[PDB]
PDB file of C-alpha atoms and ligand atoms in Angstrom:
ATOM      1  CA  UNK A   1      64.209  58.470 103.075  1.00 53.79           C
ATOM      2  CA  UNK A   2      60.414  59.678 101.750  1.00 55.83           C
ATOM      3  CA  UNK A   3      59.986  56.080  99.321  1.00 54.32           C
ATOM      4  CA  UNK A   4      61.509  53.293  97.984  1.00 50.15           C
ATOM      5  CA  UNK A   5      61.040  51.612  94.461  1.00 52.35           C
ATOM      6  CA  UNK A   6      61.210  47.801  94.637  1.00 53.32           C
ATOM      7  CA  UNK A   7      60.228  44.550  92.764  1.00 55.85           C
ATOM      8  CA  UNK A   8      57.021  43.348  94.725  1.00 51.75           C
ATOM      9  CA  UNK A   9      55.881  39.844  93.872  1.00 52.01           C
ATOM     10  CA  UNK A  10      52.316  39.583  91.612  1.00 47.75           C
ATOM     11  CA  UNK A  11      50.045  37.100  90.555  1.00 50.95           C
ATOM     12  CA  UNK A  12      50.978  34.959  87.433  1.00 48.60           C
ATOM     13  CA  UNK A  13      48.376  34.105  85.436  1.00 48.80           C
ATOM     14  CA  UNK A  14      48.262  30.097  84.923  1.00 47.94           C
ATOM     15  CA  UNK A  15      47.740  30.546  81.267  1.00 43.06           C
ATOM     16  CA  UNK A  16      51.366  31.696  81.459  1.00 39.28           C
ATOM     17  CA  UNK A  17      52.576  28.702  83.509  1.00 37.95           C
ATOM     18  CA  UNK A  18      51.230  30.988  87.341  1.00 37.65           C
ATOM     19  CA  UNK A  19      50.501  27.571  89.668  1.00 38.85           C
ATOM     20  CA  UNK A  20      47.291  27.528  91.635  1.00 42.73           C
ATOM     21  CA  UNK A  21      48.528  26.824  95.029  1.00 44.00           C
ATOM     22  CA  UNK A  22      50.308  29.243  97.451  1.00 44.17           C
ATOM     23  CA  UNK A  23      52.421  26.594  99.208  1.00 45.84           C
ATOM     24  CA  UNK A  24      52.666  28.523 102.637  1.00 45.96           C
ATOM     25  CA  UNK A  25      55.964  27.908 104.724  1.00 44.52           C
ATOM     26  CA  UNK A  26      57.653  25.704 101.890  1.00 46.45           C
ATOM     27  CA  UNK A  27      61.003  26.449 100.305  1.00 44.97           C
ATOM     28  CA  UNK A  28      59.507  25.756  96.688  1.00 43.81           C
ATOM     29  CA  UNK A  29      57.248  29.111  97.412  1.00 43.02           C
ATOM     30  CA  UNK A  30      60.978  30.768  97.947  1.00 43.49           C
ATOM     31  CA  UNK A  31      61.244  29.312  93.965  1.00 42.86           C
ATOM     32  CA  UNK A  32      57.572  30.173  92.987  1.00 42.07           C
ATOM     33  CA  UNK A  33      57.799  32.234  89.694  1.00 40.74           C
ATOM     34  CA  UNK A  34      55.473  35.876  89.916  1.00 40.91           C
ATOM     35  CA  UNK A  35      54.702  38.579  87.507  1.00 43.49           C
ATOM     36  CA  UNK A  36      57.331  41.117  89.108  1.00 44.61           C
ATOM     37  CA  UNK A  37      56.760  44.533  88.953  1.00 44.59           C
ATOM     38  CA  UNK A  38      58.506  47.299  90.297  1.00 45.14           C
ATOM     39  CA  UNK A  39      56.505  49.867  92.879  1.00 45.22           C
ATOM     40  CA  UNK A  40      56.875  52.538  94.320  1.00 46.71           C
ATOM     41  CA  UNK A  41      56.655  52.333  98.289  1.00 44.67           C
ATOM     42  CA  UNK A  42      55.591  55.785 100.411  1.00 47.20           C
ATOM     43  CA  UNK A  43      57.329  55.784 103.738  1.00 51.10           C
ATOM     44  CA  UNK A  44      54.580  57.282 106.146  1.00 50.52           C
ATOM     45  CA  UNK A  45      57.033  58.256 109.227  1.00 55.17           C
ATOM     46  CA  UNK A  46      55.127  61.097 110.850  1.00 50.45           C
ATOM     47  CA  UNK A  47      52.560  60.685 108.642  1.00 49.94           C
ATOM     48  CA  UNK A  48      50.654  57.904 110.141  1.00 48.77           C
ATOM     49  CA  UNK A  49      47.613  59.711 111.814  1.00 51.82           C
ATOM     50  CA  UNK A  50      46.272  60.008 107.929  1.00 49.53           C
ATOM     51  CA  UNK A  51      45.657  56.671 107.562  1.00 53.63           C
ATOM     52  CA  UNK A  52      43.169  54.459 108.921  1.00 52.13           C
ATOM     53  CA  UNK A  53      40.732  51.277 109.363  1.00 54.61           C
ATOM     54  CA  UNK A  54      38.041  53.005 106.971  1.00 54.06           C
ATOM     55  CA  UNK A  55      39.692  54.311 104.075  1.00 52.09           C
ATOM     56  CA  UNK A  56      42.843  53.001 103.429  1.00 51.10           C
ATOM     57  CA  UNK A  57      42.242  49.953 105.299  1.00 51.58           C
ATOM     58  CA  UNK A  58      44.987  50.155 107.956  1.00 50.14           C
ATOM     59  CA  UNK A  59      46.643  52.099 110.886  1.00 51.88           C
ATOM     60  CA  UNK A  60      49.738  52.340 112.863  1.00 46.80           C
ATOM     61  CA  UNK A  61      49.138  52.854 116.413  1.00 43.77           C
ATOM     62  CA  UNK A  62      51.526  53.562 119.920  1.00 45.86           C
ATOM     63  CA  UNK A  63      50.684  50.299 121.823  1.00 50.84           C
ATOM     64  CA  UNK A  64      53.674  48.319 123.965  1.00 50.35           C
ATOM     65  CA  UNK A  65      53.277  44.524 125.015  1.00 50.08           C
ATOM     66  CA  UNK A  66      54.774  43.116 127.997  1.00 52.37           C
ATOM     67  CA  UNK A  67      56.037  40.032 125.736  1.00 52.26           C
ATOM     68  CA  UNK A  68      59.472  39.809 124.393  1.00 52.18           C
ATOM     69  CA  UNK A  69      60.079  35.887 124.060  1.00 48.19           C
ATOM     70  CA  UNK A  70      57.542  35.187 120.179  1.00 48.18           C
ATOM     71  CA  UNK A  71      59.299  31.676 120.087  1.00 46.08           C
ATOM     72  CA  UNK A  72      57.294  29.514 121.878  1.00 50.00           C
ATOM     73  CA  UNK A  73      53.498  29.305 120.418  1.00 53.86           C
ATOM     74  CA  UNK A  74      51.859  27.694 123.215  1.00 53.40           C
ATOM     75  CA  UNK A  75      53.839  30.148 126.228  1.00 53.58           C
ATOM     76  CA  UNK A  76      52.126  33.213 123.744  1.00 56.95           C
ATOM     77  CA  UNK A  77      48.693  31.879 123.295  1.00 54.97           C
ATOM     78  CA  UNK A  78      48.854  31.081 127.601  1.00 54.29           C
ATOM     79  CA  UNK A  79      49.927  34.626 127.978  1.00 53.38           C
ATOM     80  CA  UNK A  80      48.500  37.903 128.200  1.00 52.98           C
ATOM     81  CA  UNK A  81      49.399  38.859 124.378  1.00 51.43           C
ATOM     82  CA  UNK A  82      46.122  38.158 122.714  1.00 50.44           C
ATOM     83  CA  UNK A  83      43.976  39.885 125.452  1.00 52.01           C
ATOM     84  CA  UNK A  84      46.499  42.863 125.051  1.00 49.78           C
ATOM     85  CA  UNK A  85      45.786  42.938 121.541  1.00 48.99           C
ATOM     86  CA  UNK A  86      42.000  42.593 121.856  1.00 52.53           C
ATOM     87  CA  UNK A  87      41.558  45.197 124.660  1.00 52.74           C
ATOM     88  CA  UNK A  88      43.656  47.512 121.967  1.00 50.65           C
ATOM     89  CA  UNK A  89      41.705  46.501 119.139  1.00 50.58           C
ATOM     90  CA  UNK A  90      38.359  46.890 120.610  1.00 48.38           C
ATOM     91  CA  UNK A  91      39.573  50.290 121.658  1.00 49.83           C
ATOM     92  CA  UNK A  92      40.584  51.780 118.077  1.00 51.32           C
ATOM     93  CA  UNK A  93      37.605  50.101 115.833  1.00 49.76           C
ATOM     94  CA  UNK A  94      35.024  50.788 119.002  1.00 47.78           C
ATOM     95  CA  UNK A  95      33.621  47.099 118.032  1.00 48.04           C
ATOM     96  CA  UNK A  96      31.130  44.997 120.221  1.00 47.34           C
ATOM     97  CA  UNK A  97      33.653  41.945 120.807  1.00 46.94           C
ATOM     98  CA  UNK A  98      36.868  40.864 119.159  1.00 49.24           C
ATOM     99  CA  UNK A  99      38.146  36.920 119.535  1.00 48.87           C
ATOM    100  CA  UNK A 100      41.794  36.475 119.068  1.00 50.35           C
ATOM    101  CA  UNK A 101      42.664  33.303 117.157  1.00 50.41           C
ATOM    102  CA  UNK A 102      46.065  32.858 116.585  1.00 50.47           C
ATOM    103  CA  UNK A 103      49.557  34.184 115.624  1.00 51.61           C
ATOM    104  CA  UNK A 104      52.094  33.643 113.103  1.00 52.36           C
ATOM    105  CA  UNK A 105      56.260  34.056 114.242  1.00 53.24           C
ATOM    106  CA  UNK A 106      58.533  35.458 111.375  1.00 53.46           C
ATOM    107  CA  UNK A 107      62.117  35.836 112.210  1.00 50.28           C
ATOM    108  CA  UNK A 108      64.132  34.058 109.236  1.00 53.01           C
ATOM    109  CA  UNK A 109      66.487  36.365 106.488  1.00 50.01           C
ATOM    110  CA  UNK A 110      64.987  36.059 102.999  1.00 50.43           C
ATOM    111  CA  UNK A 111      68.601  35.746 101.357  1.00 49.16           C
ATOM    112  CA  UNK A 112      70.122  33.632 104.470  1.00 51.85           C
ATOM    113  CA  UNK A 113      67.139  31.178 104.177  1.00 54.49           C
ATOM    114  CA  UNK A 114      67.316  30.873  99.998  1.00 57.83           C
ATOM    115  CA  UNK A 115      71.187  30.448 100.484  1.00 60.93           C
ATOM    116  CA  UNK A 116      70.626  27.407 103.379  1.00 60.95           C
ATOM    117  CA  UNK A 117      67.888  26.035 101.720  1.00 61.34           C
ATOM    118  CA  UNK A 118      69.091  24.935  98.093  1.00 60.90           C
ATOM    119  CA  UNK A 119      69.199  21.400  98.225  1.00 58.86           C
ATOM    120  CA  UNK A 120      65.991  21.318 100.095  1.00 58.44           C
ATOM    121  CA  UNK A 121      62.907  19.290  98.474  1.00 61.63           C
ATOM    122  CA  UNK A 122      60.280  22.294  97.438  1.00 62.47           C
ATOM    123  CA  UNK A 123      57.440  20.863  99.820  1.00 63.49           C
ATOM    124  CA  UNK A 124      59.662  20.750 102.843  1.00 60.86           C
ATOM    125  CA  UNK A 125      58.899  23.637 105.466  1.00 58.32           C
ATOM    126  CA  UNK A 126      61.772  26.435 106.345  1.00 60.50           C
ATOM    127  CA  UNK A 127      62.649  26.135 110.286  1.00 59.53           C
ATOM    128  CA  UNK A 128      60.487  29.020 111.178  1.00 59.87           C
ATOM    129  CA  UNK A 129      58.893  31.476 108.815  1.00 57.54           C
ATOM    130  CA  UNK A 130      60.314  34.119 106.151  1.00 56.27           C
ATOM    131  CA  UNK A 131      58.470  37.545 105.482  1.00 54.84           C
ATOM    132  CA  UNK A 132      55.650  37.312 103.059  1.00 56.30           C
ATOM    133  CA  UNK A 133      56.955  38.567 100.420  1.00 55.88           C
ATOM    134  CA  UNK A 134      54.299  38.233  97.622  1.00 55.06           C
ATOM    135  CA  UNK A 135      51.323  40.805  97.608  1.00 56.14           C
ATOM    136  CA  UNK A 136      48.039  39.040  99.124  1.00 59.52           C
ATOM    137  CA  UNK A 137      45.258  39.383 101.260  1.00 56.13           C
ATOM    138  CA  UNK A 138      45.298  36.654 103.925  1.00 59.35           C
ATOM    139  CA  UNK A 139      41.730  36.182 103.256  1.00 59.52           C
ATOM    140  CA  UNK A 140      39.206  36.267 100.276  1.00 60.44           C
ATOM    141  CA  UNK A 141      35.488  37.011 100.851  1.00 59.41           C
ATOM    142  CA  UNK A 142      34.964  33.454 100.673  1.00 59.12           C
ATOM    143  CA  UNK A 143      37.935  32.541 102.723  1.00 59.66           C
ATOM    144  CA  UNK A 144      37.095  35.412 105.275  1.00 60.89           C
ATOM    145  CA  UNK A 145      33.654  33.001 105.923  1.00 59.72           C
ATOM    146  CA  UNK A 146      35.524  29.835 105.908  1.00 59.01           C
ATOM    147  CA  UNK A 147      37.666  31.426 108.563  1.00 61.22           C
ATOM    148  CA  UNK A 148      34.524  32.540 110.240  1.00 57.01           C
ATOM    149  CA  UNK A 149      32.500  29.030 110.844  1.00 54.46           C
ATOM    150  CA  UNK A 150      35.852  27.128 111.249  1.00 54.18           C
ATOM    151  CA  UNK A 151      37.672  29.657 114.298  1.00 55.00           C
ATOM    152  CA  UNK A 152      34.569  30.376 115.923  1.00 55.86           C
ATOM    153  CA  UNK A 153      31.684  27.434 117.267  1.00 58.60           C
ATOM    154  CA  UNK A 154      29.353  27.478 114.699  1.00 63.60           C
ATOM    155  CA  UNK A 155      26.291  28.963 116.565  1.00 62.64           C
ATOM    156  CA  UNK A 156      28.303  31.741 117.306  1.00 65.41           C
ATOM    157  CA  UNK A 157      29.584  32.400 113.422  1.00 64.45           C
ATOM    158  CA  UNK A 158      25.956  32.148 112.593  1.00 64.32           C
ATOM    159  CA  UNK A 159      24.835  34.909 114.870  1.00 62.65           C
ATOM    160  CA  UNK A 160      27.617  36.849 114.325  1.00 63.78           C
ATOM    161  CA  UNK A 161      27.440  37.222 110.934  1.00 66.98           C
ATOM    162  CA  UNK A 162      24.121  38.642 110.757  1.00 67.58           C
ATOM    163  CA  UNK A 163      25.899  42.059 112.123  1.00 64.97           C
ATOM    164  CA  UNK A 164      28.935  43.552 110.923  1.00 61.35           C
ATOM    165  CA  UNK A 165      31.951  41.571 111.250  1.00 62.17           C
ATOM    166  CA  UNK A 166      35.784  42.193 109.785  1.00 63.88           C
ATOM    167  CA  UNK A 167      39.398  39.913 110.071  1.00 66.57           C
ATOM    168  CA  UNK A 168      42.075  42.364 111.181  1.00 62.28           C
ATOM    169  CA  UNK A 169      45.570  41.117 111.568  1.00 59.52           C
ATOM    170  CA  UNK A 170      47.710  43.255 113.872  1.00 59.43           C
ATOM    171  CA  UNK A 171      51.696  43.288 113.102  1.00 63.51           C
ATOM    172  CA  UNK A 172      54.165  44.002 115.629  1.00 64.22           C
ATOM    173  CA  UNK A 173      58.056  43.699 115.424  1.00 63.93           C
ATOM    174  CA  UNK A 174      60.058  42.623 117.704  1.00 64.96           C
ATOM    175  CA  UNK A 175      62.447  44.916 117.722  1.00 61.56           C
ATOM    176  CA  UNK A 176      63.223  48.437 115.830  1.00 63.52           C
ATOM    177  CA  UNK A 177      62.967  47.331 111.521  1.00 65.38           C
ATOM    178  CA  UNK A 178      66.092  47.403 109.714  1.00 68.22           C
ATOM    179  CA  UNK A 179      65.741  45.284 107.044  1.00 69.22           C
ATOM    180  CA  UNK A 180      62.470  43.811 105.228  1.00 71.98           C
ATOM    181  CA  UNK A 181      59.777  45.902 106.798  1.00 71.55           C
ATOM    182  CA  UNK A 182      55.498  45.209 105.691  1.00 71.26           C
ATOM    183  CA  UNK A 183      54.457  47.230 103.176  1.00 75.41           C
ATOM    184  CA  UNK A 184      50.571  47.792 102.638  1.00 73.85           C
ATOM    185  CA  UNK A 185      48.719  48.578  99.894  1.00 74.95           C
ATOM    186  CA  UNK A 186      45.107  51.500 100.181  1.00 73.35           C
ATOM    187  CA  UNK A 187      42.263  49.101  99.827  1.00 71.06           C
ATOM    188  CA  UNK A 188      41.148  52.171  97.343  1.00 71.62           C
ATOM    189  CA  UNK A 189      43.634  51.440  94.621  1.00 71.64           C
ATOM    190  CA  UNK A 190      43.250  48.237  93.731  1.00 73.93           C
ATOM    191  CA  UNK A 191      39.987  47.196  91.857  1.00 73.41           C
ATOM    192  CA  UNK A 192      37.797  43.810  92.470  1.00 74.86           C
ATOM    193  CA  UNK A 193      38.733  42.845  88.771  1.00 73.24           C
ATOM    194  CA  UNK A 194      42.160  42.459  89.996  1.00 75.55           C
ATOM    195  CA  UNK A 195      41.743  40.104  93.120  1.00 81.15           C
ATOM    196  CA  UNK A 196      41.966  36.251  92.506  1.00 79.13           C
ATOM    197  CA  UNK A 197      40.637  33.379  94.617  1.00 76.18           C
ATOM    198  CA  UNK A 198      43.795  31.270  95.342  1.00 76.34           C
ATOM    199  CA  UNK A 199      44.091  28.788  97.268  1.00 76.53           C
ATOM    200  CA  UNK A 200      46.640  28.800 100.554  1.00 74.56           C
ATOM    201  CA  UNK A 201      48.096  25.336 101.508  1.00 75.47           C
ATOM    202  CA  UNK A 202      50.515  24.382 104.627  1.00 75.45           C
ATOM    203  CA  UNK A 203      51.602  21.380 105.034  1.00 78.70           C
ATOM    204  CA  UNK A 204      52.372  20.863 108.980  1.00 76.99           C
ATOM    205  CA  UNK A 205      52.608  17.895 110.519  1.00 74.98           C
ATOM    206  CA  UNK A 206      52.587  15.945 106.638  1.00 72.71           C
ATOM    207  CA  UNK A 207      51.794  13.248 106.666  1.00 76.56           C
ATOM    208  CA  UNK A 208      49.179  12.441 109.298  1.00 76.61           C
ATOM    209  CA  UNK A 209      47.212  15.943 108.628  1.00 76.22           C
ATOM    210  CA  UNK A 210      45.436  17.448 105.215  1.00 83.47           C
ATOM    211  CA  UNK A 211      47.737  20.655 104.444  1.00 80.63           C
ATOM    212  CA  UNK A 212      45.919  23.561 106.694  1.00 83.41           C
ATOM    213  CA  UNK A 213      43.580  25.189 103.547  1.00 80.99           C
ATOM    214  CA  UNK A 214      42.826  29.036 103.454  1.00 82.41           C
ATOM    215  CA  UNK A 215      41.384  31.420 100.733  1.00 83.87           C
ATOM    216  CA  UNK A 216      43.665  34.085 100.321  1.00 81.83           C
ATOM    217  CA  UNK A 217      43.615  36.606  97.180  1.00 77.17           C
ATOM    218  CA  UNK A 218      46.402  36.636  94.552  1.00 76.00           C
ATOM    219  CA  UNK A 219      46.816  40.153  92.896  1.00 75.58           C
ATOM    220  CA  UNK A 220      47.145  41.327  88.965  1.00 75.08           C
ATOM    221  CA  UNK A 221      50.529  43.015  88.353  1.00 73.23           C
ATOM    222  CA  UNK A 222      50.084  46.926  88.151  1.00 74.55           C
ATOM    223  CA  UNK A 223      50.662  48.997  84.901  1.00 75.93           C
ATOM    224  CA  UNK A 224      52.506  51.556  86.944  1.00 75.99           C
ATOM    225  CA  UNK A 225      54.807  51.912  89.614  1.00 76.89           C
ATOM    226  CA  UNK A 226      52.511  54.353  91.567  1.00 76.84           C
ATOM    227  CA  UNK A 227      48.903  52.574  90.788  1.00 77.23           C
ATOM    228  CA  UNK A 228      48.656  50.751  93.715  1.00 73.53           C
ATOM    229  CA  UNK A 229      49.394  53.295  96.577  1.00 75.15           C
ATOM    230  CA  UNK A 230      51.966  51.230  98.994  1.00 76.05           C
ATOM    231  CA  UNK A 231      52.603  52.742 101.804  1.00 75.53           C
ATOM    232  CA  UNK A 232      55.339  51.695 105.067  1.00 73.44           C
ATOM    233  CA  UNK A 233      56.418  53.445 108.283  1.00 66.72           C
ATOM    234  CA  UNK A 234      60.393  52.847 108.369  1.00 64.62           C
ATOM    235  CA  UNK A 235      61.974  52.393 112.288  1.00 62.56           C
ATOM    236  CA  UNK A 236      58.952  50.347 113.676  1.00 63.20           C
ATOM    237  CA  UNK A 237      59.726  49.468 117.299  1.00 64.71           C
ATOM    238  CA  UNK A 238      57.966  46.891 119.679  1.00 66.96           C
ATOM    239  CA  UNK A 239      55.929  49.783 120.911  1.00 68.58           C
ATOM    240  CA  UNK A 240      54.163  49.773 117.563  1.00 68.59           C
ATOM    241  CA  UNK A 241      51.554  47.993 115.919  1.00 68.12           C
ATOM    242  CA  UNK A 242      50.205  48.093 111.943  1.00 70.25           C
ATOM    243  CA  UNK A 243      46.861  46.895 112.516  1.00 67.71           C
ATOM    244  CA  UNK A 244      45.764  45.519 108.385  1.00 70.95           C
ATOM    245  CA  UNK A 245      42.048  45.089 107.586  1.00 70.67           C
ATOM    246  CA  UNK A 246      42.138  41.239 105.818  1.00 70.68           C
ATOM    247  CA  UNK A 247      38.054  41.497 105.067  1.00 68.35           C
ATOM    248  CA  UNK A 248      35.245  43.530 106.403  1.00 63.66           C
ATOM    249  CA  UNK A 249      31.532  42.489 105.874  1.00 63.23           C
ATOM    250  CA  UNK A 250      30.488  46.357 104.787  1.00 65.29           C
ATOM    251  CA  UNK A 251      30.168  46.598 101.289  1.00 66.89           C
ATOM    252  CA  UNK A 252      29.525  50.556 101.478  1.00 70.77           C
ATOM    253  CA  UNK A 253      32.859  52.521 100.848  1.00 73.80           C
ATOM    254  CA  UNK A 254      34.999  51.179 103.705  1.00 72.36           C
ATOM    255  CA  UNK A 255      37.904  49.582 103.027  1.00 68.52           C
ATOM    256  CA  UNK A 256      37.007  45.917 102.756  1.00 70.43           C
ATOM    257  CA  UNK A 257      40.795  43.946 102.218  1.00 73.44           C
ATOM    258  CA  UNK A 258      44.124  45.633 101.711  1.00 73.36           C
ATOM    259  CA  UNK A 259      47.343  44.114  99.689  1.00 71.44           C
ATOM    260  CA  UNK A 260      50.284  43.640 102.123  1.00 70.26           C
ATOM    261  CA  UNK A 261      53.676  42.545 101.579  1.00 70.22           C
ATOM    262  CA  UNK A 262      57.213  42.397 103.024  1.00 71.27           C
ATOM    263  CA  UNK A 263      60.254  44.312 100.792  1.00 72.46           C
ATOM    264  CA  UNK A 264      64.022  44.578 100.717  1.00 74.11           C
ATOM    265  CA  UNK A 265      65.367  47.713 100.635  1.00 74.32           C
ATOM    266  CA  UNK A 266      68.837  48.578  99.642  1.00 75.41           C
ATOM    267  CA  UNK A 267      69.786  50.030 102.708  1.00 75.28           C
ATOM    268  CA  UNK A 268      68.963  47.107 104.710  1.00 76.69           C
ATOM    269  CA  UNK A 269      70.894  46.091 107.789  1.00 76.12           C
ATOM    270  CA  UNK A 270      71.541  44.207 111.244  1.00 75.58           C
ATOM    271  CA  UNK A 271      69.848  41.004 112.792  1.00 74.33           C
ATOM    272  CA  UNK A 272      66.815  39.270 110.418  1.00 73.46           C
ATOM    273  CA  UNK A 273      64.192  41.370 111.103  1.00 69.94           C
ATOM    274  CA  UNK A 274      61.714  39.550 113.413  1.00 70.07           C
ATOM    275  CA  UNK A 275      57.786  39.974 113.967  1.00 69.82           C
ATOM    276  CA  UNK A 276      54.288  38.441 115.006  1.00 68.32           C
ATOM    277  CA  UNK A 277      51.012  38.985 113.209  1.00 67.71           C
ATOM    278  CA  UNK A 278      47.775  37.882 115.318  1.00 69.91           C
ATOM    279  CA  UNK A 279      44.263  36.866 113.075  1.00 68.37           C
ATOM    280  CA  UNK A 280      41.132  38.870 115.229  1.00 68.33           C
ATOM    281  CA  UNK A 281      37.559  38.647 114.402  1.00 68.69           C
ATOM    282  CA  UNK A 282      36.274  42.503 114.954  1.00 69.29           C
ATOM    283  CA  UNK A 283      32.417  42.567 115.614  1.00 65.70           C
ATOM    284  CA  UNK A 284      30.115  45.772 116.134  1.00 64.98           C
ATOM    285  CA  UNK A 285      26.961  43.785 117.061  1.00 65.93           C
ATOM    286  CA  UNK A 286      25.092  46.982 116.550  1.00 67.60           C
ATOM    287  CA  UNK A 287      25.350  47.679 113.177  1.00 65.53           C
ATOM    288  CA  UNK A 288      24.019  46.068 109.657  1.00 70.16           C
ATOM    289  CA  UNK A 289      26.548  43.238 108.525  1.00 63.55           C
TER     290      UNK A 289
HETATM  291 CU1   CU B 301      49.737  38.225 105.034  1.00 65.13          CU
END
């Protein structure tokens, strides 16, 4: 199939009753009300090589991992995934260093989880993780240099950020996408007048910690179906990776933060689908920030 048209999830404005918290891994964000709008979605299946890091803002590459078993956090973050990921990484953006921070596990049905959910308080947290399906950035400009000084030792961040620096989330499944795949959005055709500073608040291990707090960017709803250029690759297998540019210092042309989100399709089918996306700090040390 060449596209899809689907609903996507956009910002609504507060003056129109739009909260200002995204309450991250709650079942009340399941219940959050959103400007909908339907879009049209380009399936890029053999058409992947025309997209990348600098203009649209992502790639799909060929890269296998030697992990199957995403369930345990610790037995990942012990294991050879993240070096896997930065050897890759460093490979395709020919950067100076890239740290590997952390991962997030998605492997719950949408529908299933709505359905099981119901008489569940809204702040209470799913039992793993739903696709992220409402259009964001997981990082605004500002958030991008919270995330900076508060993942890295600060002498580091400091240094770092005098060359150029990006966040760039890589997104693998875990096995071949039947239903709910990501779809991504060209950094090109969506304007700054449309991003919002919103922000992002999890509430593990309530009630002895603050809520984790990020900076992500909410989205204005498009006029258009095909105004925002959202793009997929259906059939994604293990042996692929979506690598999404979050933020990127340059302020030239590059791509500097590209719109993702997850989307049913009608001819969804089979197990939940089930991924991992994995923050990484890019750095080229040799070049103006
Ligand atoms: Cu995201």
């Amino acid at each position: 199939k060449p596209y899809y048209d689907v609903e996507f999830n956009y910002r609504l404005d507060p003056r129109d009753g739009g909260d200002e918290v995204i309450w991250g891994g709650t079942v009340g964000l399941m219940r959050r009300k959103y400007e909908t709008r339907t879009v049209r979605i380009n399936n890029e299946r053999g058409n992947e090589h025309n997209f990348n890091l600098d203009t649209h803002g992502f790639a799909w590459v060929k890269h296998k991992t030697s992990v199957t078993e995403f369930a345990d956090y610790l037995a990942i973050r012990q294991g050879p995934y993240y070096g896997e990921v930065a050897e890759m990484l460093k490979r395709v953006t020919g950067a100076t260093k890239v740290h590997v921070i952390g991962h997030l596990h998605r492997s719950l049905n949408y529908n299933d989880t709505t359905e099981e959910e119901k008489n569940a308080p809204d702040m209470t947290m799913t039992k793993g993780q739903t696709p992220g399906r409402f259009v964001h950035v997981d990082q605004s400009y500002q958030g991008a240099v919270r995330r900076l000084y508060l993942d890295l030792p600060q002498e580091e961040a400091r240094r770092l950020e005098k060359t150029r620096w990006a966040i760039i989330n890589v997104w693998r499944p875990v096995r071949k996408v039947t239903n709910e795949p990501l779809a991504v959005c060209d950094a090109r055709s969506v304007r700054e007048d449309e991003l919002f500073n919103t922000l992002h608040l999890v509430p593990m291990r309530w009630p002895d910690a603050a809520p984790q707090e990020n900076q992500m960017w909410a989205v204005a709803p498009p006029k258009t179906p095909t105004q925002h250029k959202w793009h997929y690759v259906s059939g994604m297998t293990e042996d692929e990776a979506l690598l999404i540019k979050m933020f990127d210092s340059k302020k030239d042309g590059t791509a500097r933060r590209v719109p993702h989100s997850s989307f049913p399709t009608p001819d969804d089918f089979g197990e939940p689908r089930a991924s991992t996306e994995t923050r990484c700090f890019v750095f080229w040390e040799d070049q103006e920030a």
